[PDB]
Amino acid sequence: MLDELVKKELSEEEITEIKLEEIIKYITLIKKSKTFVSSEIRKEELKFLSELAESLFELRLSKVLEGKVGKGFDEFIFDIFKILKQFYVDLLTGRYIIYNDKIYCIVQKPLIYNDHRVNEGDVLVLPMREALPLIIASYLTPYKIDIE
Amino acid sequence: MLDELVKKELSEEEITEIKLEEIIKYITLIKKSKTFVSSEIRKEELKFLSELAESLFELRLSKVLEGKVGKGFDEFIFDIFKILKQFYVDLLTGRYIIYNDKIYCIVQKPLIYNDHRVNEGDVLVLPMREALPLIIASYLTPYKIDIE
Amino acid sequence: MIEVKLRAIKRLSNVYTRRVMIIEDWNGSSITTGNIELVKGSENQLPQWLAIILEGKKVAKIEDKISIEDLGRILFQERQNMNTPASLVPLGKDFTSRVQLYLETLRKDNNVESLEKLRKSIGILNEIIKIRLRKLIQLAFLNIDDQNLINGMTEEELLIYKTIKQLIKELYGD
Amino acid sequence: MIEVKLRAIKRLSNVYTRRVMIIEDWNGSSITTGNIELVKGSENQLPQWLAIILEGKKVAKIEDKISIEDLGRILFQERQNMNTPASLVPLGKDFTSRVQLYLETLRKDNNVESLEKLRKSIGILNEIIKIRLRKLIQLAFLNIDDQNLINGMTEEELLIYKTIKQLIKELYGDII
């Protein structure tokens, strides 16, 4: 249950190993409950369960910020967080080429931008607000300057 | 340098408004310095600036975790963090259809997945570690089970 | 500083077990408790969120509610040894949740008596919080790990106590 | 969240401004200061990391180092009004880093006189920390106008002070 996962996350200093099998088991329980749980109880319980899941995310992400190593089903979520941090550090240390709010990027996979086809190896200049999601999705990588 | 932004972030409870022009100012100085700053001084200095950039990210993300509303050049980074949070809550509250480690998603833009072309409106069942980056890049949107 | 953990503690308290005397038959289900069947004249243990729903429907009644007399008694016992840091009254983990529910019901009724009783309760709680914080911070500054004292702290107070202990040890041990 | 602020404080101490006495002519550059020209006999202000680099090259000498005589004077002034929470001696944000530098040079010498000054300085520091921490905790509960007192705190003491005031306020809001 979610309350158990939140309670163990508060008491432990390290990030608890929440395996994917346990998450799939609890999601199956939620789906099965639709057969027996009334709509009134299910609606009120959704608020308290979503608040517990929200806290579980916050507690585990706080430990990631403090320096704890994340392991479990949500490791792919923490990896996205590390990409956000590395983009942040590269940007402030001048490793990127910025024109106003746009950034130079190298295309990794065939992509359609502004109704135009770009292929792997091409260079695209586009706002950071649109480049970073495409970086996380491995469609783009930022053009890097070696300031060392 | 970046120490100005870190000090102000460390003293105020709310997220400081760091305009993009402030970031451009420091990036410009880092770029110009490569022509007249010795490599010995510049290497040690860039190490300190990189650590200060990490701290600025960590301090502002800590305030986002607590509920503060962020405004500034890095607002698009915080919005991605909220996408990770909402995906986490929706998953643990049974709002997504999960099949083994995969998840049902609705296609939003033309997509090439596994060398196969899919278009808007199509449904794709792919692993979560691959689906979430495509959700952030607006190529996919997870199929949300309507309650009741 | 500890806003994330304070919310997590509060949201955990909505699932804490509460004693309830069932007054009307009712059978239903939830994700937490599964299929349950209640019966009149039988005390049962339910999560706090479910007990509040069943109390508003007059299905059952919550028994272990905090009162203004309990707050005045805690304040009195706290003033007897105001300068003694190791004289915290043992409150427990459910004290904060029961107080939050007490102020929630008074503010929901919106009666005139609920307003003046609320102001009197806030004045008592402010005196209780200040005195207990004086003792709790001093215990952290003195660095005294007493298992009997730690149990007497609420979850929120224990978090504050450990945060300042670790902050002093890290800053003046480095 | 305290761990994030600890790293930020430790990383800020590298860029504290230090008053340095120039002993040898040297013109150089850095990203922080740009191109600067240092002349003998003139005091200048430099970031701490750069002042240490120029000190190791015998280019200049840091002037505002802390000493055991300074530690004894601070302990004396702190003892003058131990029960007064608003009687903190103004130290500065760079005080902690300067003390760590003075203690590190005493360990580097490895002399009998240096190890004796190291133990005595640690003893004085312990008494200073005890007195200042007690005044700091009381100051956090007093709710007084604290602007000159905040300026007089070190960076680590300011973190302790504001963390206590924030924890008290957050517990008040969570209960009330």
Author numbering:
A (entry chain A), B (entry chain B): 1 to 148
C (entry chain D): 1 to 174
D (entry chain C): 1 to 176
Publication text:
Eukaryotes and archaea partly achieve this regulation by strictly controlling the activation of hexameric minichromosome maintenance (MCM) helicase rings that unwind DNA during its replication. In eukaryotes, MCM activation critically relies on the sequential recruitment of the essential factors Cdc45 and a tetrameric GINS complex at the onset of the S-phase to generate a larger CMG complex. Archaea also use a six-membered MCM ring to unwind DNA, and archaea possess GINS and Cdc45 homologs that stimulate the activities of MCM in biochemical DNA-unwinding assays. We present the crystal structure of the tetrameric GINS complex from the archaeal organism Saccharolobus solfataricus (Sso) to reveal a core structure that is highly similar to the previously determined GINS core structures of other eukaryotes and archaea.
The structure adopts a tetrameric architecture, with two copies of GINS51 and two copies of GINS23 in an approximately twofold-symmetric complex. Each subunit has two subdomains, with a larger α-helical subdomain (A) and a smaller subdomain that contains β-strands (B), consistent with the structures of other archaeal and eukaryotic GINS protein structures. The order of the A and B subdomains is reversed between the two subunits, with the A subdomain first in SsoGINS51 and the B subdomain first in SsoGINS23. In the archaeal structures, the core consists of both complete GINS23 subunits and the two GINS51A sub­domains. The underlying subdomain structure of GINS51B, Sld5B and Psf1B is conserved, but its placement relative to the GINS tetramer core varies among the structures. In the case of SsoGINS, the two GINS51B subdomains have a unique and sizable dimeric interaction surface. We therefore conclude that the dimeric interface of the SsoGINS51B subdomains of the crystal structure is not compatible with the simultaneous adoption of an interaction with polymerase as identified for TkGINS. Hence, the SsoGINS–RecJ interaction of the AlphaFold-Multimer model is consistent with the interactions observed in both archaea and eukaryotes and would not sterically clash with the conformation of the SsoGINS crystal structure. Although it is not known whether an SsoCMG structure would closely match eukaryotic CMG structures, this analysis shows that the 51B subdomain would need to move a large distance from its crystal structure position to accommodate a eukaryote-like CMG structure.
